[PDB]
Amino acid sequence: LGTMPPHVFAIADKAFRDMKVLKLSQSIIVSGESGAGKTENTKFVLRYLTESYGTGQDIDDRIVEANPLLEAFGNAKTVRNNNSSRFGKFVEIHFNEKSSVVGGFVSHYLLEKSRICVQGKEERNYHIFYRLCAGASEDIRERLHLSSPDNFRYLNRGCTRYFANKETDKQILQNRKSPEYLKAGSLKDPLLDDHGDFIRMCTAMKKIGLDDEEKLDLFRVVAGVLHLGNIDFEEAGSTSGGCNLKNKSTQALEYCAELLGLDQDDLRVSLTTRVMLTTAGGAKGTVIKVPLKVEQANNARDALAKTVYSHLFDHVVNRVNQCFPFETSSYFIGVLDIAGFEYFEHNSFEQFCINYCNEKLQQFFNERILKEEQELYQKEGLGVNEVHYVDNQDCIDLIEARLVGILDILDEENRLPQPSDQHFTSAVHQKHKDHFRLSIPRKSKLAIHRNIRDDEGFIIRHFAGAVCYETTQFVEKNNDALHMSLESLICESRDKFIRELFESSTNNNKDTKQKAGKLSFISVGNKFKTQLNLLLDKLRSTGASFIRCIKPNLKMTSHHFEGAQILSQLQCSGMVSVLDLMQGGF
Amino acid sequence: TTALVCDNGSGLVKAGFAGDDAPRAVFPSIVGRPRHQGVMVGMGQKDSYVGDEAQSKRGILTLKYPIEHGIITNWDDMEKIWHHTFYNELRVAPEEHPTLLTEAPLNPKANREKMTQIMFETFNVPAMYVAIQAVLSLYASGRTTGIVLDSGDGVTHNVPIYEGYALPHAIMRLDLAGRDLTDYLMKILTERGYSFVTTAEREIVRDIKEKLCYVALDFENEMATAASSSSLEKSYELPDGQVITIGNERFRCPETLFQPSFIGMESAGIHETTYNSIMKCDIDIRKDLYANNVMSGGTTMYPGIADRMQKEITALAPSTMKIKIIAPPERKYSVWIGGSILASLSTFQQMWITKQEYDEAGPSIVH
Amino acid sequence: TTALVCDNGSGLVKAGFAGDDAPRAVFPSIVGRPRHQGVMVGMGQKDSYVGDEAQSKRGILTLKYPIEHGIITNWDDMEKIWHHTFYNELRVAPEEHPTLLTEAPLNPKANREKMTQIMFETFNVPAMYVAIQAVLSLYASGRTTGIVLDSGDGVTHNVPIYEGYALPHAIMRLDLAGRDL
Ligand SMILES: Nc1ncnc2c1ncn2[C@@H]1O[C@H](COP(=O)(O)OP(=O)(O)O)[C@@H](O)[C@H]1O
Ligand SMILES: [Mg+2]
Ligand SMILES: [Mg+2]
């Protein structure tokens, strides 16, 4: 107090003495818009704690080096800035009762799985697929059955351009360039280079534990997700079956069964059928097969592709967690890195999950930054009287509320026969009582909301502003239903590496009459609500400290301060109301 | 909390909680008193053996199916089916589950009134709803339009539903399938020198109704190929050790479903009752009833239907028009997986009759 | 800013902004209530579908044309035409458009006042004018004299105009076409 001029390391010294005073674990929460230095200033904090207080970790360097590695897996390109993270990582650096540093643990929350399937128009997919089709050699790309992006179903939407420097561009062979690359070349950035970042990815792979042959089995999983997506389905049955495959998807199904290691015939009668049995319902029975619809074959292929990327990302972080494992514990310092209110001009389902997480973080900030601090001004000698905060708990119990909330109408649409995005949009305003937090696009005076018809989207007024969400493919995005015949095939793959992507608690023993067949539909919107309220119990149960990083301009240029661009990041992050409760009588 | 879908078949009463997987209990529904003198005198023997114990005890009981053409044999045996099923199979608590029972589209009142009232007073369920078996097969089928065929022993039905309203003036009930297919199979099996006169012995016929029967390519031409006997005659072995080799009758029994002159009723076969129900629907809508022709139940499980049914209807239905028949696997449990989809969906959980509503109205105002 | 030309068709209501090319909305005009029992789980279906969606639901609704014998049926269905068209077809803003409505020369009052008045109070219109459909065909033909035929389902009319005066002693209205055809 009073001997530290404002700096990031004046915050890191303060959230280590509360471990020694009141002896409660402290979570560093870095807020701010995307691409603002919340990951780079975090690496400075991890170097400060292991010098000034903590007696070091195993090795510093791996945590720093492997962070851009996991940003190949999680970063994409958004409208706001080129390098944006599509995952909310949560670092857990553990200590013990004495306060010795015992090791770390890196996880992930809010993984944008939807991005794998649909890439918009000016967005990318994940940044690892553009580093694999750009950086992989010609005695490597023919072996993994790779080609330019226009050949893959999961890369025929969005941007197919590579981020590559002028010298780099000519050093990537012409066969790896798409029609958009022929039309308008590489994407230009001074720090993002896809072929350079493939070298700084694979060098960092051998720094966390991987063998160079073991990186090739990781490349077979990424290429197997690309050659799974290419299966194109069709209709079937003289007296009605449900689904078949297309003729050109026979060569694509063989290269997919060659990369994954699961058989083609056993996958062709699993992407097309719903296997069920009559043995359970009686004393004897049989196991029949009931064909799925054509859209449910494509949505099951997409759920199977999102299931493999889910466990590959969790298997990679377990390899990294194994390169600095913890020991005995009690104190710990967490470091959150997630994007605040990243809304655009076309908003969908994933921007509503970001804004829903922001309404919970702002309700957290009203009871951890304003309530506790002004209780301490009201007890530490001065005795200061209360100033009340401006509540938003009613907006949260519109989004996630049981039976009358928005996800409780979205998840009820997918279980219905013939789901519709227009029927779900009209059911949201039919169930809603028309209160100020939500209204139809026709009730907004803005010109940008004029073009949206009342059954094609809805406007939620959030604490940081009013955001309109289009309902095109909203119901489709919430489906992720993994069929039981596909679970006893991708988990139980013939190839050992693929099989070892799965382990406890995900894998577990089962026996007859357990007593039902769950989780069926699963639900994306309640997958994120289950892991968000589970991370909320870890934020409300632990201490915290708040650092907010504001960009000086949106081009990332030195010595340039813009009074319109800096102001919008102060107005879309909770500033004015929090600096009105704090003023009070002193 | 979770509701219970219980389908009142005549088979094959089906029971399982609301979704997301196969019925928990399926059983042959029969009650049988012991019709012999059991001179061993333990004693300890049940007054009524229910199914399945009454399908082990064939020949020492006199089997009585609970419903006879959709009407109860008496509610003393019906209630006993239910009680036996709920308590010593499922092991469900009556106060814990809202229930769902099923009926037939044109079934005579007051069989749904008296039922709803007795199940509320006897088992004391906190809510109840009764769905017709055809409507539940729409939800299982997953289409928004079409004519639904619920064909079970002993009553079949033909209900047209359009996007997703019901047409009152085109609903057809045929009493042709399925107990008359059992009796006709029993009537043409005497021709091969063996007989099955008792209640228990009718079950042996029921097992041959499942496995051995086939359906013609076209009747007149299957009758032609019938003069060649090798492919026609297949030899089954029966649980009493006897081998029966049946020929013409192998395709003759399912063929009954077209032109029921064999049964002697004046009404036409499923072929023509389908056409006459389609041309009793409104002129504009008929175009999209074609290609949403959906079969269901267990008595539609003979091999040559529905592609016989398809080829015959397509000849009588308008030219150019596409007649696609819908007969997926699972149809014996279609109704039940339908019911599961219904009772799991909000908001229509709140279209069940609740205990407060029942207490006020009693056996009045069902619909 | 820009004015909006909405022709209160007898048929066949037509709508599109002023200048240059063709209308942006053509639809049969019908409002239709559901004429059968709704067995489905459902249950968001409209109690009143307007066109074009009420022509995608033939045989399961009871179609009611909103303008009969050139007179509005009731302003309940007529307003619903307007509201449906403006909001989910044209996508127009309430106070941004000066509007133009159409009429027939011998059509009884108070049908044009009550329309004009209700439309000003309901949609909050900044400026309005109501032209007879025959007068609009003068501009379309590009002549300054002649006898004009606005013939729609179910009222035709016959107005002679002379450079560029109207003749009160020669205006004829026939209930001869087109719903009677
Ligand atoms: N493979 C089969 N071939 C022909 N008939 C069958 C077959 N399996 C079952 N059945 C008949 O179907 C009936 C069961 O039909 P079901 O769908 O249970 O009707 P409900 O549901 O109305 O009771 C049985 O009586 C049996 O005779
Ligand atoms: Mg039935
Ligand atoms: Mg006219």
Short mmCIF file of C-alpha atoms in Angstrom, two decimals, chain B:
data_model
loop_
_atom_site.label_atom_id
_atom_site.label_comp_id
_atom_site.label_asym_id
_atom_site.label_seq_id
_atom_site.Cartn_x
_atom_site.Cartn_y
_atom_site.Cartn_z
CA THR B 1 -41.68 -37.57 -11.33
CA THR B 2 -41.25 -39.21 -14.77
CA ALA B 3 -44.51 -40.43 -16.37
CA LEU B 4 -45.28 -44.02 -17.40
CA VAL B 5 -46.20 -45.09 -20.97
CA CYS B 6 -48.32 -48.24 -20.83
CA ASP B 7 -49.81 -49.36 -24.13
CA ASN B 8 -52.99 -51.44 -24.00
CA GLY B 9 -52.23 -53.82 -26.84
CA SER B 10 -54.00 -57.17 -27.12
CA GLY B 11 -50.66 -58.92 -27.51
CA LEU B 12 -48.18 -57.69 -25.90
CA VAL B 13 -49.31 -55.08 -23.46
CA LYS B 14 -46.24 -52.80 -23.39
CA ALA B 15 -44.86 -50.88 -20.38
CA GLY B 16 -41.89 -48.55 -19.81
CA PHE B 17 -41.28 -45.09 -18.32
CA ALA B 18 -41.29 -41.99 -20.59
CA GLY B 19 -38.26 -42.37 -22.95
CA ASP B 20 -35.48 -42.64 -24.10
CA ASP B 21 -35.11 -46.34 -24.89
CA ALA B 22 -36.94 -49.70 -25.37
CA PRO B 23 -40.04 -50.78 -23.26
CA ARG B 24 -39.08 -52.21 -19.83
CA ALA B 25 -41.77 -54.91 -19.88
CA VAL B 26 -43.53 -56.71 -22.75
CA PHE B 27 -45.68 -59.76 -21.85
CA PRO B 28 -48.39 -62.01 -23.46
CA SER B 29 -51.32 -60.50 -21.41
CA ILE B 30 -53.32 -63.76 -20.84
CA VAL B 31 -55.06 -64.75 -17.56
CA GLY B 32 -55.76 -68.46 -16.95
CA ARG B 33 -57.49 -70.32 -14.10
CA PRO B 34 -56.30 -73.94 -13.51
CA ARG B 35 -58.84 -76.13 -15.34
CA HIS B 36 -57.46 -79.48 -14.16
CA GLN B 37 -57.43 -81.25 -10.80
CA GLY B 38 -53.89 -80.88 -9.37
CA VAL B 39 -53.93 -84.07 -7.28
CA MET B 40 -50.39 -83.47 -5.92
CA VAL B 41 -51.98 -80.95 -3.49
CA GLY B 42 -49.07 -78.72 -2.32
CA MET B 43 -51.32 -76.61 -2.34
CA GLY B 44 -50.16 -72.96 -2.81
CA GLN B 45 -51.18 -72.51 -6.46
CA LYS B 46 -52.38 -69.09 -7.80
CA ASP B 47 -56.13 -68.66 -8.57
CA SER B 48 -55.17 -66.75 -11.69
CA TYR B 49 -51.78 -67.08 -13.32
CA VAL B 50 -51.04 -63.97 -15.39
CA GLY B 51 -48.63 -63.77 -18.35
CA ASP B 52 -45.74 -64.75 -18.61
CA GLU B 53 -46.37 -67.54 -16.05
CA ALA B 54 -49.53 -68.48 -18.03
CA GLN B 55 -47.40 -69.03 -21.20
CA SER B 56 -45.17 -71.46 -19.32
CA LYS B 57 -48.27 -73.21 -17.93
CA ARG B 58 -49.84 -73.99 -21.34
CA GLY B 59 -52.38 -76.85 -21.20
CA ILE B 60 -53.13 -76.74 -17.45
CA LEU B 61 -55.07 -73.45 -17.65
CA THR B 62 -57.88 -71.95 -19.80
CA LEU B 63 -56.47 -68.79 -21.39
CA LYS B 64 -58.57 -65.59 -21.57
CA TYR B 65 -57.12 -62.53 -23.35
CA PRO B 66 -58.12 -59.28 -21.45
CA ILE B 67 -59.77 -57.38 -24.33
CA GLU B 68 -61.91 -58.88 -27.10
CA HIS B 69 -62.17 -56.58 -30.14
CA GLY B 70 -61.09 -53.57 -27.99
CA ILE B 71 -63.70 -54.19 -25.26
CA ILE B 72 -62.94 -55.62 -21.80
CA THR B 73 -63.63 -59.27 -20.86
CA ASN B 74 -64.50 -57.87 -17.37
CA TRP B 75 -62.58 -55.21 -15.38
CA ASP B 76 -61.72 -57.80 -12.66
CA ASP B 77 -59.17 -59.46 -14.98
CA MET B 78 -58.08 -56.17 -16.62
CA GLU B 79 -57.25 -54.60 -13.20
CA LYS B 80 -55.39 -57.82 -12.30
CA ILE B 81 -53.22 -57.49 -15.46
CA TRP B 82 -52.33 -53.96 -14.40
CA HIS B 83 -51.69 -54.75 -10.68
CA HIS B 84 -49.52 -57.83 -11.53
CA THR B 85 -47.52 -55.80 -14.09
CA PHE B 86 -46.95 -52.72 -11.94
CA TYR B 87 -46.04 -54.58 -8.74
CA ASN B 88 -44.02 -57.76 -9.55
CA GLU B 89 -42.35 -56.69 -12.82
CA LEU B 90 -41.76 -52.91 -12.98
CA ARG B 91 -41.82 -52.41 -9.17
CA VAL B 92 -43.22 -48.88 -9.56
CA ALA B 93 -44.91 -46.78 -6.83
CA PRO B 94 -48.48 -45.72 -7.90
CA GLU B 95 -48.34 -42.29 -6.19
CA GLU B 96 -45.02 -41.42 -7.93
CA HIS B 97 -45.99 -41.60 -11.64
CA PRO B 98 -48.47 -39.77 -13.89
CA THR B 99 -49.69 -42.59 -16.18
CA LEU B 100 -50.60 -42.89 -19.87
CA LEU B 101 -52.98 -45.63 -21.11
CA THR B 102 -53.94 -46.13 -24.79
CA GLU B 103 -57.18 -46.92 -26.66
CA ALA B 104 -58.57 -47.38 -30.22
CA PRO B 105 -59.88 -44.42 -32.38
CA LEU B 106 -63.53 -45.54 -32.72
CA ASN B 107 -63.69 -47.69 -29.54
CA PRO B 108 -67.17 -47.72 -27.84
CA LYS B 109 -67.73 -45.43 -24.82
CA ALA B 110 -67.86 -45.79 -21.73
CA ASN B 111 -64.73 -47.99 -21.86
CA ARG B 112 -62.43 -44.92 -21.64
CA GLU B 113 -64.58 -43.25 -18.91
CA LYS B 114 -64.92 -46.39 -16.69
CA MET B 115 -61.19 -47.12 -17.28
CA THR B 116 -59.96 -43.60 -16.37
CA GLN B 117 -62.22 -43.64 -13.28
CA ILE B 118 -61.25 -47.16 -12.08
CA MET B 119 -57.49 -46.49 -12.53
CA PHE B 120 -57.85 -43.22 -10.55
CA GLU B 121 -59.80 -44.90 -7.71
CA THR B 122 -57.82 -48.18 -7.61
CA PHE B 123 -54.21 -47.18 -8.18
CA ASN B 124 -54.55 -43.51 -7.09
CA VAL B 125 -52.24 -42.08 -9.80
CA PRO B 126 -51.87 -38.27 -9.57
CA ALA B 127 -52.51 -37.65 -13.29
CA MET B 128 -53.62 -39.62 -16.37
CA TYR B 129 -53.99 -39.19 -20.15
CA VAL B 130 -55.31 -41.53 -22.87
CA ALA B 131 -53.86 -41.32 -26.39
CA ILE B 132 -55.14 -43.26 -29.44
CA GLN B 133 -52.57 -45.82 -30.76
CA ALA B 134 -52.55 -44.35 -34.28
CA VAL B 135 -51.66 -40.78 -33.11
CA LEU B 136 -48.67 -42.11 -31.16
CA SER B 137 -47.37 -43.83 -34.34
CA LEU B 138 -47.22 -40.37 -36.02
CA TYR B 139 -44.77 -39.07 -33.42
CA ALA B 140 -42.66 -42.24 -33.74
CA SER B 141 -42.79 -41.94 -37.57
CA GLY B 142 -41.72 -38.25 -37.35
CA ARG B 143 -43.65 -37.02 -40.39
CA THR B 144 -46.23 -34.17 -40.22
CA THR B 145 -48.95 -35.73 -42.44
CA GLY B 146 -50.22 -39.20 -43.48
CA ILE B 147 -52.57 -42.14 -43.06
CA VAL B 148 -51.76 -44.31 -40.04
CA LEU B 149 -52.37 -48.09 -39.88
CA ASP B 150 -52.46 -49.49 -36.24
CA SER B 151 -52.85 -53.15 -36.92
CA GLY B 152 -52.74 -55.38 -33.89
CA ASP B 153 -54.75 -58.33 -32.76
CA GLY B 154 -57.92 -58.11 -32.88
CA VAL B 155 -58.73 -54.68 -34.40
CA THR B 156 -56.91 -52.71 -37.15
CA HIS B 157 -57.57 -49.00 -37.86
CA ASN B 158 -56.95 -46.45 -40.66
CA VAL B 159 -56.60 -42.80 -39.43
CA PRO B 160 -55.63 -39.91 -41.83
CA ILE B 161 -53.84 -36.92 -40.17
CA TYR B 162 -52.84 -33.73 -42.10
CA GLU B 163 -50.28 -31.08 -40.98
CA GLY B 164 -51.20 -31.91 -38.06
CA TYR B 165 -54.99 -31.70 -37.88
CA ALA B 166 -57.35 -34.70 -37.92
CA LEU B 167 -59.93 -35.33 -40.64
CA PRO B 168 -63.14 -36.60 -38.90
CA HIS B 169 -64.92 -37.84 -42.04
CA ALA B 170 -62.29 -40.30 -43.31
CA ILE B 171 -61.54 -42.60 -40.31
CA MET B 172 -61.98 -46.35 -41.07
CA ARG B 173 -62.10 -49.26 -38.57
CA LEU B 174 -61.68 -52.76 -40.09
CA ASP B 175 -62.21 -55.75 -37.72
CA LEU B 176 -60.18 -57.92 -40.19
CA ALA B 177 -56.78 -58.14 -38.41
CA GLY B 178 -55.34 -59.83 -36.28
CA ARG B 179 -57.31 -62.44 -34.24
CA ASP B 180 -59.16 -63.42 -37.44
CA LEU B 181 -55.76 -64.04 -39.05
CA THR B 182 -55.04 -66.36 -36.06
CA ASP B 183 -58.43 -68.11 -36.46
CA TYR B 184 -58.05 -68.37 -40.27
CA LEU B 185 -54.54 -69.86 -39.85
CA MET B 186 -56.10 -72.34 -37.41
CA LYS B 187 -58.89 -73.09 -39.95
CA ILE B 188 -56.50 -73.88 -42.81
CA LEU B 189 -54.05 -75.84 -40.62
CA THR B 190 -56.65 -78.62 -39.99
CA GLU B 191 -56.32 -79.43 -43.70
CA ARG B 192 -52.87 -80.95 -42.99
CA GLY B 193 -54.08 -83.56 -40.52
CA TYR B 194 -53.42 -81.98 -37.12
CA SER B 195 -55.55 -79.78 -34.84
CA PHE B 196 -55.31 -77.22 -32.07
CA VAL B 197 -58.77 -77.05 -30.47
CA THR B 198 -57.90 -75.71 -26.98
CA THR B 199 -57.12 -72.15 -25.69
CA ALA B 200 -53.55 -73.19 -24.92
CA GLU B 201 -53.16 -74.90 -28.35
CA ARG B 202 -54.17 -71.63 -30.11
CA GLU B 203 -50.83 -70.27 -28.77
CA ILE B 204 -48.93 -72.89 -30.82
CA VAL B 205 -50.74 -71.40 -33.87
CA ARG B 206 -49.64 -67.88 -32.73
CA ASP B 207 -45.98 -69.01 -32.84
CA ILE B 208 -46.52 -70.32 -36.43
CA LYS B 209 -48.21 -66.93 -37.21
CA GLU B 210 -44.92 -65.15 -36.37
CA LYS B 211 -42.27 -67.32 -37.98
CA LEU B 212 -43.53 -69.49 -40.87
CA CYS B 213 -46.13 -67.54 -42.96
CA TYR B 214 -45.25 -65.59 -46.16
CA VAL B 215 -47.17 -63.28 -48.55
CA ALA B 216 -47.75 -63.71 -52.31
CA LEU B 217 -45.88 -61.92 -55.10
CA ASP B 218 -49.28 -61.51 -56.76
CA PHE B 219 -52.08 -63.97 -55.66
CA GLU B 220 -52.97 -65.37 -59.12
CA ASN B 221 -49.29 -65.91 -60.08
CA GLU B 222 -48.28 -67.28 -56.62
CA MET B 223 -51.11 -69.80 -57.16
CA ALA B 224 -49.36 -70.69 -60.46
CA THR B 225 -45.94 -71.28 -58.79
CA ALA B 226 -47.80 -73.20 -56.06
CA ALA B 227 -48.18 -76.12 -58.52
CA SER B 228 -44.39 -76.52 -58.05
CA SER B 229 -44.17 -77.88 -54.46
CA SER B 230 -40.46 -77.71 -53.41
CA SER B 231 -40.15 -73.97 -52.57
CA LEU B 232 -43.77 -73.75 -51.44
CA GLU B 233 -43.65 -76.55 -48.82
CA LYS B 234 -41.49 -75.72 -45.78
CA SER B 235 -41.41 -78.10 -42.79
CA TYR B 236 -41.65 -76.65 -39.24
CA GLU B 237 -41.12 -78.64 -36.01
CA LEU B 238 -43.48 -77.94 -33.11
CA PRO B 239 -42.86 -78.24 -29.32
CA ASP B 240 -44.75 -81.58 -29.05
CA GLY B 241 -42.14 -83.15 -31.37
CA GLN B 242 -44.30 -83.22 -34.50
CA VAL B 243 -43.25 -81.87 -37.92
CA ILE B 244 -45.90 -80.07 -40.00
CA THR B 245 -45.20 -79.37 -43.68
CA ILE B 246 -47.54 -76.65 -44.98
CA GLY B 247 -47.88 -75.56 -48.64
CA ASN B 248 -50.52 -73.27 -50.25
CA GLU B 249 -51.78 -72.21 -46.80
CA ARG B 250 -48.29 -70.73 -46.10
CA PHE B 251 -49.17 -67.81 -48.40
CA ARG B 252 -52.94 -68.27 -48.07
CA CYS B 253 -53.19 -67.01 -44.47
CA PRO B 254 -51.62 -63.48 -45.00
CA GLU B 255 -53.36 -63.16 -48.40
CA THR B 256 -56.64 -62.93 -46.35
CA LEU B 257 -55.70 -59.25 -45.80
CA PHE B 258 -56.58 -58.62 -49.47
CA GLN B 259 -60.22 -59.50 -50.38
CA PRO B 260 -61.56 -60.99 -47.06
CA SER B 261 -64.01 -63.37 -48.86
CA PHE B 262 -62.28 -66.06 -46.75
CA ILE B 263 -63.66 -64.41 -43.54
CA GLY B 264 -66.94 -63.72 -45.41
CA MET B 265 -67.41 -60.04 -44.50
CA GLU B 266 -68.76 -57.77 -47.30
CA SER B 267 -66.17 -55.01 -46.72
CA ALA B 268 -63.14 -54.81 -49.01
CA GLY B 269 -59.41 -55.46 -48.30
CA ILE B 270 -56.85 -52.97 -46.94
CA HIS B 271 -55.99 -52.07 -50.56
CA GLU B 272 -59.48 -50.68 -51.25
CA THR B 273 -60.24 -49.29 -47.74
CA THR B 274 -57.06 -47.23 -48.15
CA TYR B 275 -58.22 -45.85 -51.54
CA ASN B 276 -61.78 -45.12 -50.31
CA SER B 277 -60.38 -43.31 -47.21
CA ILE B 278 -58.02 -41.21 -49.37
CA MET B 279 -60.90 -40.26 -51.73
CA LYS B 280 -62.98 -39.28 -48.67
CA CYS B 281 -60.39 -36.59 -47.91
CA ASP B 282 -60.57 -33.01 -49.27
CA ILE B 283 -59.67 -32.46 -52.96
CA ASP B 284 -56.71 -30.16 -52.35
CA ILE B 285 -55.06 -32.26 -49.57
CA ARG B 286 -54.96 -35.69 -51.30
CA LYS B 287 -51.76 -34.84 -53.25
CA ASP B 288 -49.62 -34.94 -50.06
CA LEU B 289 -51.42 -37.89 -48.42
CA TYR B 290 -49.75 -39.93 -51.19
CA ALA B 291 -46.18 -40.76 -50.01
CA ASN B 292 -47.10 -40.49 -46.33
CA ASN B 293 -48.79 -43.91 -46.23
CA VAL B 294 -47.51 -45.33 -42.87
CA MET B 295 -47.96 -48.91 -41.63
CA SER B 296 -47.45 -49.80 -37.94
CA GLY B 297 -48.02 -52.50 -35.27
CA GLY B 298 -46.88 -56.12 -35.09
CA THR B 299 -49.45 -57.64 -37.47
CA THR B 300 -47.81 -55.71 -40.32
CA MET B 301 -44.66 -57.83 -39.80
CA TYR B 302 -45.42 -60.49 -42.49
CA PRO B 303 -42.56 -60.37 -45.15
CA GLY B 304 -44.39 -59.52 -48.45
CA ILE B 305 -46.38 -56.61 -47.00
CA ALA B 306 -45.91 -53.62 -47.51
CA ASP B 307 -44.43 -54.00 -51.03
CA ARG B 308 -47.48 -56.02 -52.15
CA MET B 309 -49.67 -53.28 -50.57
CA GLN B 310 -47.57 -50.60 -52.34
CA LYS B 311 -47.72 -52.18 -55.83
CA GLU B 312 -51.53 -52.73 -55.47
CA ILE B 313 -52.35 -49.21 -54.16
CA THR B 314 -50.08 -47.53 -56.78
CA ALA B 315 -52.18 -49.22 -59.51
CA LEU B 316 -55.50 -47.85 -58.17
CA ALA B 317 -54.20 -44.44 -57.03
CA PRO B 318 -53.76 -41.66 -59.74
CA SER B 319 -51.01 -41.87 -62.41
CA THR B 320 -47.82 -39.70 -62.11
CA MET B 321 -48.51 -39.31 -58.38
CA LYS B 322 -45.79 -40.88 -56.18
CA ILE B 323 -47.09 -43.45 -53.68
CA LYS B 324 -44.31 -44.24 -51.22
CA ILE B 325 -45.21 -46.66 -48.45
CA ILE B 326 -43.58 -46.15 -45.06
CA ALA B 327 -42.84 -49.33 -43.13
CA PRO B 328 -39.56 -49.00 -41.14
CA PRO B 329 -38.33 -51.64 -38.62
CA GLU B 330 -39.49 -51.50 -34.94
CA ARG B 331 -43.22 -51.23 -35.78
CA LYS B 332 -44.32 -53.58 -32.95
CA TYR B 333 -42.94 -50.99 -30.51
CA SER B 334 -43.82 -47.94 -32.71
CA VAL B 335 -46.84 -47.00 -30.62
CA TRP B 336 -44.80 -47.29 -27.42
CA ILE B 337 -41.75 -45.19 -28.60
CA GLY B 338 -44.41 -42.72 -29.82
CA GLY B 339 -45.95 -42.52 -26.35
CA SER B 340 -42.44 -41.96 -24.93
CA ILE B 341 -41.88 -38.95 -27.24
CA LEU B 342 -45.27 -37.50 -26.21
CA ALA B 343 -45.08 -37.73 -22.37
CA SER B 344 -41.48 -36.44 -22.40
CA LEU B 345 -42.44 -33.24 -24.33
CA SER B 346 -43.25 -30.04 -22.50
CA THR B 347 -45.68 -28.21 -22.56
CA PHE B 348 -48.08 -31.10 -23.35
CA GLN B 349 -47.31 -32.66 -19.92
CA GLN B 350 -49.91 -30.07 -18.89
CA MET B 351 -52.58 -31.56 -21.15
CA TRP B 352 -52.88 -34.57 -18.80
CA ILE B 353 -55.97 -34.96 -16.57
CA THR B 354 -54.77 -34.01 -13.07
CA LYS B 355 -56.23 -35.25 -9.75
CA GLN B 356 -58.00 -31.90 -9.06
CA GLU B 357 -59.76 -32.09 -12.47
CA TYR B 358 -60.75 -35.76 -11.88
CA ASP B 359 -62.02 -35.03 -8.34
CA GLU B 360 -64.40 -32.39 -9.76
CA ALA B 361 -65.64 -34.23 -12.87
CA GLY B 362 -65.35 -37.94 -11.91
CA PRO B 363 -66.26 -40.04 -14.98
CA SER B 364 -67.63 -36.94 -16.81
CA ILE B 365 -66.10 -34.84 -19.67
CA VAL B 366 -63.14 -36.89 -21.00
CA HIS B 367 -62.67 -35.01 -24.28
#
